[PDB]
Amino acid sequence: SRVGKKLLEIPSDVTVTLNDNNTVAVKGPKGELTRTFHPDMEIKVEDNVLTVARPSDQKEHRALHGTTRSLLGNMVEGVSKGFERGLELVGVGYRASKSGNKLVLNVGYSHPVEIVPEEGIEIEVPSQTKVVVKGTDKERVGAIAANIRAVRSPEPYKGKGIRYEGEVVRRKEGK
Amino acid sequence: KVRPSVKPICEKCKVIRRKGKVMVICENPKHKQKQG
Amino acid sequence: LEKTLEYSENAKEFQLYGELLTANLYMLKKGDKQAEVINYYDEESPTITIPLNPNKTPSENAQAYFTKYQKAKNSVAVVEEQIRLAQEEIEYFDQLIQQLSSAS
Amino acid sequence: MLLPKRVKYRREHRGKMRGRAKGGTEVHFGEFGIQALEASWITNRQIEAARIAMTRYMKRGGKVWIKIFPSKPYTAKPLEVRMGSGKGAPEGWVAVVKPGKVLFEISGVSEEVAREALRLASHKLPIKTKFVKREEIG
Amino acid sequence: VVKLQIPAGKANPAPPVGPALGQAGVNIMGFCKEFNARTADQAGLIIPVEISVYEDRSFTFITKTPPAAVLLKKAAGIESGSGEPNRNKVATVKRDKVREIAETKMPDLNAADVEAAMRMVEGTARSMGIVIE
RNA sequence: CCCAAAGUAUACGUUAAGUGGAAAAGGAUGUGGAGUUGCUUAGACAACCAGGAUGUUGGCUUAGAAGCAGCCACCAUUUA
């Protein structure tokens, strides 16, 4: 009836550590993740499946069990498959550009837009409009997508600026 | 809009309690209400 | 009011033009005006028409024509009522002119 | 606008509002009503506002029974004068309402129509309100 | 595919068959004669015709049965229905032509038995305002 | 508890705001309790894979109301 009871099958080939004071390092083919946890939870790992168990029925533990199991699922999904957040630059003069590892956006400002990616996160620009960010952590690619959207928010009258996949902006009528 | 009478205007409105403050979020941005 | 009674017959032609535009509004939507229209009614096959529309929407121009037609038929009701009231008022005022003209 | 057209005395003591309602505690004319929880004077202007607020939303339905009447006058001395030198002139009329008293009575409509009409009436009143209905033991 | 109910006796001009076949990319006037050829023996009634679409601009039309509403107008005689059905009982249709109307709808309706079909067209007759008697 | 004399006393709960240590109408999926009621391992509320229909564009209605302007008895099948 809750997410802390369903099994989480991991693919081949990954492995997980069970270090003291609840520090979890996850190894895999596409990177490395390490997070610090809370000492109140006891974590146990079985054969090719991960389980998180609650200590009590309190509301803090009921939240924390679900958050821990969800972020472990995010780790095992990102270490083997990864996560992509696709963005589209809609407009007659909009362009994402590449100069080495630097990402350049030809947004209609009077100054060229440059954003510095962090380590382990890559951005590829295949075409006129569509751009793909690549990473192994959902938090980092979400922060990168938010930072890309922050330089130009989409305005409601016409489709301009940074836009995700399918999501409706509120259409307004001008004069 | 900031008012001490935060209420769901339409059926799509959802009442939430971010940061100890009663709030209403909705698909329509005109229905966004906060108190405190 | 009789001018609006002639505008009643004028509005019907506009409604017909809007219907013709609707049965043909699937192409040249962007900036649509003076587009030749093939006769949808009668065996007359009358000369292709060339409707001119403002830059709202290709459907909202025909829809605006159809709204003007609804207002026109409500006008057919109300202006005939107003003409009846106006002749009643003119008869009463001509009578009042008569009674004031011969009065002490 | 409710007021007596004749009174025995035009100036009266303000009285006290201790205890529960002496009468008019149970709903016995309409199906639903407002039961008072606190005691204060209710001005006939507030009664008129609540009555219009119920009657407008019940444009089709039964009539409203007004269980309270503003029989007690209150005097208001004119402004910017010294204290004393005689009691002032009467200004308006209020009804002494105690907790537990039924204020307005509605029958002949649906449940939610009556609840919303009583809520719109209660938002005009200066007292805490609650929704009550007839009980049939009986 | 775009399906539509085409009247038999007014299929020549630019109404209904015009803009439906225009957006498909075919000449309407070259197929109006083909429509009027197969709608000759059911003329005066509005017949739904399926309009299949192909990539090579060749079009073959699969005609359907007349609707139960139009067939009840044929069985009764009145053209336009009442303002409020089951409030102004304008007509009464006997059960034998009801059975005939139900039997006409064999090749398109997926009913296993004719009794199910006559129970369906009893329900369609109630929407007509027509007494099933 | 210390200033400041004497319990960082015992048992059972409650509050998470510095309420305690400043007021109301009104608003609110805060939380601890008490009591009904529909369902529930014949498998419950949500989530993910599929059906989401032909009589039928049900009628009146505006060109057009094709379930989704309005008024409307609001039915019948294939059936999981």
Short mmCIF file of all heavy atoms in Angstrom, two decimals, chain E residues 10 12 18 26 29 36 46 51 60 64 66 75 82 93-94 103 105 110 119 121-122 126 129 132:
data_model
loop_
_atom_site.label_atom_id
_atom_site.label_comp_id
_atom_site.label_asym_id
_atom_site.label_seq_id
_atom_site.Cartn_x
_atom_site.Cartn_y
_atom_site.Cartn_z
N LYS E 10 -28.94 15.37 -52.94
CA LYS E 10 -28.23 16.65 -52.96
C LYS E 10 -26.73 16.41 -52.78
O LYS E 10 -26.07 17.09 -51.98
CB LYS E 10 -28.79 17.61 -51.91
CG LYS E 10 -28.56 19.10 -52.17
CD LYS E 10 -29.36 19.96 -51.21
CE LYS E 10 -28.78 19.90 -49.80
NZ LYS E 10 -29.52 20.80 -48.87
N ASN E 12 -24.59 16.44 -55.42
CA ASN E 12 -23.85 17.14 -56.46
C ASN E 12 -23.06 18.37 -56.01
O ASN E 12 -21.87 18.45 -56.37
CB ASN E 12 -24.81 17.51 -57.61
CG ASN E 12 -25.62 16.34 -58.11
OD1 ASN E 12 -26.47 15.81 -57.39
ND2 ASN E 12 -25.38 15.93 -59.35
N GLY E 18 -18.10 18.21 -50.53
CA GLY E 18 -17.08 19.11 -51.00
C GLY E 18 -15.84 19.23 -50.13
O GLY E 18 -14.75 18.81 -50.52
N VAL E 26 -8.75 15.05 -53.73
CA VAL E 26 -9.37 14.45 -54.91
C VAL E 26 -10.44 15.40 -55.43
O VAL E 26 -10.95 16.25 -54.69
CB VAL E 26 -9.95 13.04 -54.57
CG1 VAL E 26 -11.24 13.14 -53.76
CG2 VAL E 26 -10.11 12.17 -55.82
N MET E 29 -16.19 16.49 -58.10
CA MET E 29 -17.13 16.35 -59.21
C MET E 29 -16.93 15.06 -59.99
O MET E 29 -17.88 14.59 -60.64
CB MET E 29 -17.01 17.55 -60.15
CG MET E 29 -17.08 18.91 -59.46
SD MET E 29 -18.73 19.40 -58.91
CE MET E 29 -18.62 19.08 -57.15
N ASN E 36 -24.08 9.41 -56.99
CA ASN E 36 -25.46 9.45 -57.45
C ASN E 36 -25.86 8.19 -58.19
O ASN E 36 -27.06 7.89 -58.31
CB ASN E 36 -25.67 10.68 -58.34
CG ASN E 36 -25.62 11.97 -57.56
OD1 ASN E 36 -25.78 11.99 -56.34
ND2 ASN E 36 -25.38 13.07 -58.26
N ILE E 46 -31.03 10.30 -46.43
CA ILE E 46 -29.64 10.64 -46.10
C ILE E 46 -28.95 9.34 -45.73
O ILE E 46 -29.33 8.66 -44.77
CB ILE E 46 -29.55 11.69 -44.99
CG1 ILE E 46 -30.16 13.04 -45.39
CG2 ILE E 46 -28.10 11.90 -44.60
CD1 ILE E 46 -31.65 13.22 -45.05
N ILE E 51 -15.83 6.76 -46.10
CA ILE E 51 -14.90 7.34 -47.06
C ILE E 51 -13.50 6.88 -46.67
O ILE E 51 -12.82 7.51 -45.85
CB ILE E 51 -15.00 8.87 -47.11
CG1 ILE E 51 -16.45 9.32 -47.27
CG2 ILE E 51 -14.14 9.43 -48.24
CD1 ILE E 51 -17.10 8.86 -48.56
N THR E 60 -12.30 4.02 -52.86
CA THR E 60 -13.43 3.10 -52.95
C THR E 60 -14.30 3.31 -51.73
O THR E 60 -13.81 3.28 -50.59
CB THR E 60 -12.96 1.65 -53.04
OG1 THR E 60 -12.00 1.39 -52.00
CG2 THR E 60 -12.32 1.37 -54.39
N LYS E 64 -23.33 2.23 -46.38
CA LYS E 64 -23.94 1.64 -45.20
C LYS E 64 -25.46 1.68 -45.33
O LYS E 64 -26.01 2.20 -46.30
CB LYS E 64 -23.49 2.36 -43.93
CG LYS E 64 -22.03 2.12 -43.57
CD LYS E 64 -21.76 0.65 -43.28
CE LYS E 64 -20.32 0.43 -42.86
NZ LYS E 64 -20.00 -1.02 -42.72
N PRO E 66 -29.33 2.86 -44.31
CA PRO E 66 -29.96 4.09 -43.80
C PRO E 66 -30.11 4.05 -42.29
O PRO E 66 -30.26 2.96 -41.71
CB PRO E 66 -31.33 4.11 -44.50
CG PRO E 66 -31.49 2.76 -45.14
CD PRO E 66 -30.11 2.26 -45.40
N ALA E 75 -41.18 5.18 -42.26
CA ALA E 75 -42.27 4.34 -41.77
C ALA E 75 -43.42 5.17 -41.22
O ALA E 75 -44.59 4.78 -41.33
CB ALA E 75 -41.75 3.38 -40.70
N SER E 82 -40.54 15.78 -32.91
CA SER E 82 -41.20 16.66 -31.97
C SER E 82 -40.18 17.44 -31.15
O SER E 82 -39.00 17.10 -31.09
CB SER E 82 -42.11 15.85 -31.04
OG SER E 82 -41.41 14.78 -30.44
N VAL E 93 -46.01 3.72 -34.95
CA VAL E 93 -45.50 2.84 -36.00
C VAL E 93 -45.70 1.39 -35.57
O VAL E 93 -45.29 0.99 -34.48
CB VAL E 93 -44.01 3.14 -36.28
CG1 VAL E 93 -43.38 2.05 -37.11
CG2 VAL E 93 -43.88 4.48 -37.01
N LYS E 94 -46.34 0.60 -36.44
CA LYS E 94 -46.65 -0.79 -36.15
C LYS E 94 -45.39 -1.65 -36.17
O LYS E 94 -44.37 -1.26 -36.76
CB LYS E 94 -47.67 -1.33 -37.15
CG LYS E 94 -48.93 -0.49 -37.27
CD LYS E 94 -49.61 -0.29 -35.92
CE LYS E 94 -50.95 0.41 -36.07
NZ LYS E 94 -50.78 1.79 -36.60
N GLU E 103 -34.44 -5.73 -39.67
CA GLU E 103 -33.87 -6.72 -40.57
C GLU E 103 -33.03 -6.09 -41.67
O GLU E 103 -32.20 -6.77 -42.28
CB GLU E 103 -34.99 -7.58 -41.19
CG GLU E 103 -35.45 -8.73 -40.31
CD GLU E 103 -34.72 -10.03 -40.62
OE1 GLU E 103 -33.56 -9.98 -41.08
OE2 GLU E 103 -35.32 -11.11 -40.42
N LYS E 105 -30.80 -3.86 -41.11
CA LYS E 105 -29.51 -3.54 -40.50
C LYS E 105 -28.66 -4.77 -40.18
O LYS E 105 -27.86 -4.72 -39.24
CB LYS E 105 -29.72 -2.71 -39.24
CG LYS E 105 -30.30 -1.33 -39.51
CD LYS E 105 -30.22 -0.44 -38.28
CE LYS E 105 -30.75 0.95 -38.57
NZ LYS E 105 -29.88 1.69 -39.53
N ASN E 110 -23.48 -5.44 -35.42
CA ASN E 110 -22.86 -6.66 -34.93
C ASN E 110 -23.77 -7.46 -34.01
O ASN E 110 -23.28 -8.22 -33.16
CB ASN E 110 -21.54 -6.33 -34.22
CG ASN E 110 -21.75 -5.48 -32.98
OD1 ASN E 110 -22.69 -4.68 -32.91
ND2 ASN E 110 -20.88 -5.64 -31.99
N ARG E 119 -35.14 -5.07 -30.23
CA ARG E 119 -35.02 -4.38 -28.95
C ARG E 119 -34.18 -3.10 -29.05
O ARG E 119 -34.45 -2.15 -28.31
CB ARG E 119 -34.43 -5.32 -27.90
CG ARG E 119 -35.42 -6.35 -27.39
CD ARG E 119 -34.73 -7.41 -26.54
NE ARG E 119 -34.07 -8.41 -27.36
CZ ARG E 119 -33.40 -9.45 -26.87
NH1 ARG E 119 -33.29 -9.62 -25.56
NH2 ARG E 119 -32.83 -10.32 -27.70
N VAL E 121 -34.02 -1.16 -31.90
CA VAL E 121 -34.79 -0.17 -32.65
C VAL E 121 -36.08 0.21 -31.92
O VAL E 121 -36.67 1.25 -32.24
CB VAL E 121 -35.08 -0.63 -34.08
CG1 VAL E 121 -33.78 -0.94 -34.82
CG2 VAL E 121 -35.98 -1.83 -34.09
N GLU E 122 -36.51 -0.58 -30.93
CA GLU E 122 -37.50 -0.09 -29.97
C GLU E 122 -36.96 1.08 -29.16
O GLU E 122 -37.68 2.05 -28.91
CB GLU E 122 -37.92 -1.23 -29.03
CG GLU E 122 -39.06 -2.09 -29.55
CD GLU E 122 -39.34 -3.27 -28.64
OE1 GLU E 122 -38.79 -3.31 -27.52
OE2 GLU E 122 -40.14 -4.14 -29.04
N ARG E 126 -38.16 5.11 -29.24
CA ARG E 126 -38.51 5.93 -28.08
C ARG E 126 -37.83 7.29 -28.13
O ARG E 126 -38.40 8.28 -27.66
CB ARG E 126 -38.13 5.18 -26.79
CG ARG E 126 -38.65 5.81 -25.51
CD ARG E 126 -38.31 4.96 -24.30
NE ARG E 126 -38.98 3.66 -24.34
CZ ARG E 126 -40.23 3.45 -23.93
NH1 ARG E 126 -40.94 4.45 -23.43
NH2 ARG E 126 -40.76 2.24 -24.01
N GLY E 129 -39.88 9.97 -30.24
CA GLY E 129 -41.19 10.43 -29.83
C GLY E 129 -42.32 9.62 -30.41
O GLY E 129 -43.49 9.99 -30.25
N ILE E 132 -44.30 2.94 -29.83
CA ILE E 132 -43.98 1.61 -30.35
C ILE E 132 -45.23 0.73 -30.20
O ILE E 132 -45.39 -0.03 -29.24
CB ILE E 132 -42.71 1.04 -29.70
CG1 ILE E 132 -42.27 -0.28 -30.37
CG2 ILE E 132 -42.68 1.12 -28.14
CD1 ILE E 132 -41.83 -0.11 -31.80
#
